[PDB]
Amino acid sequence: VLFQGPGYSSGPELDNRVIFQSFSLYQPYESNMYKILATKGDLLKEWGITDVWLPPAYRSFNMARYMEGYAIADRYDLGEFNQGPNNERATKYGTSDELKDMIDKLHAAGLKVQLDLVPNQLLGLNGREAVYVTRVDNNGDLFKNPYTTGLTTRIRADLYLAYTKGGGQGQAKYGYIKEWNKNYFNGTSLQGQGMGRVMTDDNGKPYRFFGPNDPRNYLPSWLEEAAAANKINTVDTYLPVDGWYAAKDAATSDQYWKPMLIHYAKDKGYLSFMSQHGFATVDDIINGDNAEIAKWTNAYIQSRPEYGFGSEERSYKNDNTGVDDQDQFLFVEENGSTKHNIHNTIHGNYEFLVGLDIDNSNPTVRKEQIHWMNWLLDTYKFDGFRIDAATHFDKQVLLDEADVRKAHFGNDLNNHLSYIESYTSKAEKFENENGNPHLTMDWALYYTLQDTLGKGTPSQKLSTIATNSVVNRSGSGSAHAIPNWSFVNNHDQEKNRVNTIMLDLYGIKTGEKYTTTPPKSFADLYDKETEKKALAIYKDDMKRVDKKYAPNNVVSQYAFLLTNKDTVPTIYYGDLYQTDASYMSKPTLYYEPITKLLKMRKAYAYGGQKITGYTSNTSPETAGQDLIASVRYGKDRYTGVAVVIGTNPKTDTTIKVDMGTKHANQVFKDATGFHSEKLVADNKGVLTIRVKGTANALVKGYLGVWVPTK
Ligand SMILES: [Ca+2]
Numbered sequence: 199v200l201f202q203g204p205g206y207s208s209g210p211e212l213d214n215r216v217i218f219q220s221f222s223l224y225q226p227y228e229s230n231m232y233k234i235l236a237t238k239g240d241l242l243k244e245w246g247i248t249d250v251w252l253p254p255a256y257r258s259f260n261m262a263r264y265m266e267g268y269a270i271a272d273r274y275d276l277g278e279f280n281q282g283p284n285n286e287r288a289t290k291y292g293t294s295d296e297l298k299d300m301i302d303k304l305h306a307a308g309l310k311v312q313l314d315l316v317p318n319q320l321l322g323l324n325g326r327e328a329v330y331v332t333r334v335d336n337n338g339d340l341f342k343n344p345y346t347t348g349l350t351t352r353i354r355a356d357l358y359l360a361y362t363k364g365g366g367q368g369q370a371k372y373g374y375i376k377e378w379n380k381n382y383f384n385g386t387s388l389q390g391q392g393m394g395r396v397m398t399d400d401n402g403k404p405y406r407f408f409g410p411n412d413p414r415n416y417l418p419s420w421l422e423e424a425a426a427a428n429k430i431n432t433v434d435t436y437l438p439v440d441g442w443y444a445a446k447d448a449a450t451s452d453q454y455w456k457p458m459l460i461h462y463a464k465d466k467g468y469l470s471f472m473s474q475h476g477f478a479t480v481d482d483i484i485n486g487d488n489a490e491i492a493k494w495t496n497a498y499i500q501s502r503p504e505y506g507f508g509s510e511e512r513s514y515k516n517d518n519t520g521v522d523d524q525d526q527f528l529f530v531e532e533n534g535s536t537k538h539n540i541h542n543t544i545h546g547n548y549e550f551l552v553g554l555d556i557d558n559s560n561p562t563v564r565k566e567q568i569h570w571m572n573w574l575l576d577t578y579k580f581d582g583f584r585i586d587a588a589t590h591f592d593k594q595v596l597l598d599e600a601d602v603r604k605a606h607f608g609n610d611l612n613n614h615l616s617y618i619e620s621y622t623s624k625a626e627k628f629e630n631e632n633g634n635p636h637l638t639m640d641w642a643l644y645y646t647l648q649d650t651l652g653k654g655t656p657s658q659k660l661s662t663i664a665t666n667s668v669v670n671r672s673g674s675g676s677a678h679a680i681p682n683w684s685f686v687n688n689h690d691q692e693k694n695r696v697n698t699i700m701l702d703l704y705g706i707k708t709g710e711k712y713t714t715t716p717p718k719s720f721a722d723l724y725d726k727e728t729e730k731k732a733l734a735i736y737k738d739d740m741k742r743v744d745k746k747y748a749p750n751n752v753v754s755q756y757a758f759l760l761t762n763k764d765t766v767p768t769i770y771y772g773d774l775y776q777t778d779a780s781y782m783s784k785p786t787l788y789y790e791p792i793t794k795l796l797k798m799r800k801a802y803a804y805g806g807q808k809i810t811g812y813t814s815n816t817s818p819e820t821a822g823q824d825l826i827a828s829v830r831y832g833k834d835r836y837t838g839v840a841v842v843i844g845t846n847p848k849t850d851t852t853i854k855v856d857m858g859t860k861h862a863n864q865v866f867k868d869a870t871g872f873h874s875e876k877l878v879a880d881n882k883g884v885l886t887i888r889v890k891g892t893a894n895a896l897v898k899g900y901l902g903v904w905v906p907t908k
Contacts, residue, residue: 204609205633206681208669208764210804212612216246216760216796217768221253221291222689223264224696224733224778229288231781232296238782239307245793246800247769249615250304251584253291254314257281257366259322263520263724265290267314268586269321269553272366273570276578279367301579310581310613313574317567317595318587320378321553323364327380328396328434330534331358331527333511334385337547338528338540345514346712353511355534357396357404358527359433360386362554374569375562382563384538384555385528387521388512394504397437397462405437420461423448430458439465439505440496445484456484457495471498507719514717516706518697519690522721526550542592544620544628551590558592567595571602581607581614585636588618589625596628600635615766617683626668626680637766640684643667647686647758652749654898656845661822664809669764671828675807679764686755687770692777695747699732700724733778741787743895753791753870754901757841760799761830761903763807769796787895791870795903798869802839802905805831812853814889816846824899825889827855835860836908839869842887844900849891855904857883866904873902 206212220235231253242250254267255276260283262269267289275281278294287293301311333341333353341351362380370376397405399418406416410428417425424430427448431441437458445456459468460483469480475494477483483491503509513524530536539559540549549555557563574580582603588596599616607614617637618625629638646666649658664672669679697720701708704723712718740748749755752773759767771777774792776784808829811822825844832838840855857866861883865876877885889900 202604202609203633203635204611205635206611206637207634208676208679208681212681212766213763213803215248215612215615215766216799217249217251217615217617217683217766218242218245218247219251219685219688219768219770221251221266222770222772222777223266223693224772225290225781226778227265227290228780229286229290229292231290232292232300234781236296236300236303239304239309242304242309243307245769245796247796248310249581249766250309250311251617251768252311252313252580254316254586255289255291255297255578256316257289257368261322267291268316270316271320271322271364272368273316273320274368274372274573275366276368281366281368297578305579310615312582312584312615312617313578313580314586315571315574315583315599316586317556317558318551318591319553319555320365323361323378323554325361325363326359326433326438327362328436329358329360329362329380329527330355330530330532331360331385332356332530332534332536334526334528334550335513335524336526336550338384338526338549339547341511341513341524341526343511343513345710346511346717351511353393353527355530355532356393357436358393359391359395359436359438360389360527362386372573373566375566378554380529381537382557382560383529384536384540384549384557385526386554387523387550387552388507388510388525388527390507390510392503392505392507393509394464394502395439397439397441397458398464400464406435407432407437408435418461418463421458424458429455440499454484455488457491459495459498460484465502465504467502468495468498471501507722512717512719512721514712514719516701516708516710516718516720518694518701518708520693520697520720520724521552523551526555539592542594544589544593544596544624545622546624548590551587556591558595564592564594564598568598568602571599575602575606582616585616585618588636589620589622593628596636597632615683617766623668630680634681637681637683638668640668640682640765643669643684643759644686644691647755648749651751651754651758651843651845654744654750656824659820659823660826660843660845661809661811663758663826663828667762669762671762671764671807671809673808675763681766682764683766683768684759684762685768685770686752686759687749687773688768689770689772692770692772696729696732696736699735699747700728703728703731737776737778741895743893750898751845751896751901752788753795753896754843754899756788756792756795757870757901757903758828758843760795761803761807761828761839761841763830767799791896794869794871798839798903798905802832802837802869803830804833804837807831808856810855812851814844814846814849814851816844816849816891824849825851825853827853829855829857831858832860832906835864836906838906840866840885840887840902840904842889842900842902842904844889844891846899847891847893849889849900851889853887853889855885855887857885857906859883861906865907867907869903869905870901872897877904879906
């Protein structure tokens with residue numbers, strides 16, 4: 199008879215929680231965020247923040263676009279080891295010691311903290327192995343080049359040298375797995391090593407070198423000296439095109455190490471490139487200093503598609519996410535079979551995103567993940583986890599994560615939140631089937647807010663904000679709402695909008711079919727100057743009236759988000775603060791209105807919820823098209839709030855907003871500051887509200903947020 203597992207239940211208790219997403223991608227590499235955030239506990243308390251989502255604190259691949267901590271080179275180095283640029287301890291955000299102290303101070307302020315947990319992938323390991331690859335999309339289905347030739351790929355169980363082995367000193371010291379390798383990955387996003395990277399004969403047989411004596415060797419005439427000598431650069435017996443070998447005087451002479459491209463017959467273009475770079479003859483190379491050899495012989499490698507992305511059939515989708523997740527190799531065996539199970543995700547497919555995709559179906563990997571989570575709670579005292587890419591790996595890991603929390607904190611779920619990053623309703627089904635061990639992300643309301651209120655001149659009925667949510671708030675509300683965390687904006691969706699600007703600047707349309715023209719690559723073109731330009735554009739756009747890129751009616755969105763019954767709302771860092779400035783140095787035009795909306799919620803956001811649709815002059819036919827009221831009735835006469843919203847600047851109507859009988863003959867005041875009229879509720883607690891349409895930077899249509907005196 200076991201009693202381990204209430205699960206989350208949506209109700210007034212859980213509705214008390216508010217998550218602050220503490221970070222964006224565009225924060226500067228300043229190694230100071232922890233030191234600063236350590237001081238903000240009281241401020242956060244004022245707003246009714248209960249939980250702080252912290253960035254992924256792990257060591258970043260050094261060439262990561264944002265250095266943010268999702269491209270993980272070492273999963274156990276959170277600013278502890280000397281593995282940063284110039285062997286610094288600090289991550290983007292600061293040292294482990296600073297992280298420890300900051301968590302200490304934030305607990306001291308009565309807040310909880312979640313780490314951004316990243317089970318899906320690693321990126322940027324230093325050591326290569328040989329794998330077989332099949333060219334597949336994000337779902338692991340054979341890739342069909344839909345934006346180029348439309349041909350089904352013939353890259354099927356082909357030989358490839360990938361970066362698959364490493365993991366840093368953290369892993370090596372604290373890990374269950376001590377080193378990652380190819381066996382532990384379902385595959386990798388294209389690494390631009392090229393399909394001709396292994397040295398082959400004229401038919402297609404790879405060259406092999408196990409040892410000097412070995413009868414399993416298969417080399418050409420010329421390498422037999424280096425073979426007997428045992429001086430060939432190899433990878434798992436295979437010969438890489440970039441590899442060097444003892445050219446003249448094999449044994450007992452290590453001053454004649456030379457690029458083996460010299461007599462690699464299949465490449466007919468190298469010797470000629472070295473011609474037009476000083477080294478005119480076969481033997482001019484065999485002499486010259488390897489500084490200027492290496493320099494030039496390398497730059498050749500990069501010019502050849504057989505040795506780069508040019509042979510790997512990139513999708514060239516140029517998705518505004520900044521990742522073409524159809525750019526994958528599945529790790530297969532020689533016959534094209536695979537040990538890797540890629541259909542255990544919440545999606546059912548969609549195993550692949552970016553980087554070295556972790557085989558979360560491998561029982562050793564699964565033990566490694568439990569070990570990892572354990573070590574994180576134990577070492578850092580996080581209270582829970584924001585689960586990154588939760589819908590793109592073996593979902594067992596999610597259930598294991600819940601057990602890790604149970605083992606740590608018991609049935610005290612509410613004070614130990616976990617919330618999964620989700621953009622599909624399959625997350626809802628999964629959660630409900632398993633007793634709701636996590637908060638599911640309200641993706642649906644996010645897109646619904648963007649279409650009704652985010653868009654200038656909305657083409658979608660504003661009333662849809664009631665229905666088009668993981669929680670259906672129409673009529674009386676949801677009797678049994680799914681436990682959920684909701685948002686108006688986040689680090690990804692912002693980055694999307696910025697990338698859209700960059701694409702515009704680069705002259706690239708996402709999804710364009712390149713039949714007759716050369717395809718263009720966002721990835722190849724990415725540069726910091728263009729990013730700087732795009733950021734400048736983005737911020738200006740927020741401040742303008744007829745916004746082009748940034749969303750309209752940010753305050754209207756938050757006013758709805760922060761007054762909804764049955765949800766944990768999220769406050770996004772970059773909605774309150776300029777995204778690319780020093781951490782919490784510069785507020786936005788939305789800072790004042792939102793922080794106020796926060797004090798309001800904390801004071802007034804109690805009781806039943808009712809959403810009434812209205813007619814306006816602008817829509818006399820269909821009620822709720824452009825005008826609505828989202829009412830929290832209050833628990834007592836002194837709580838509750840009427841959120842009135844319209845989407846048309848012209849609108850000129852007077853509507854009746856019923857607050858219930860307990861709000862009879864009571865003074866209501868707009869908490870937003872937008873209207874300074876003092877309304878009095880009638881006999882029955884109805885408000886007569888004159889709706890004067892407007893258009894500036896904050897509002898397009900109408901916002902009123904009417905709260906009683908106390
Ligand atoms: Ca995956």
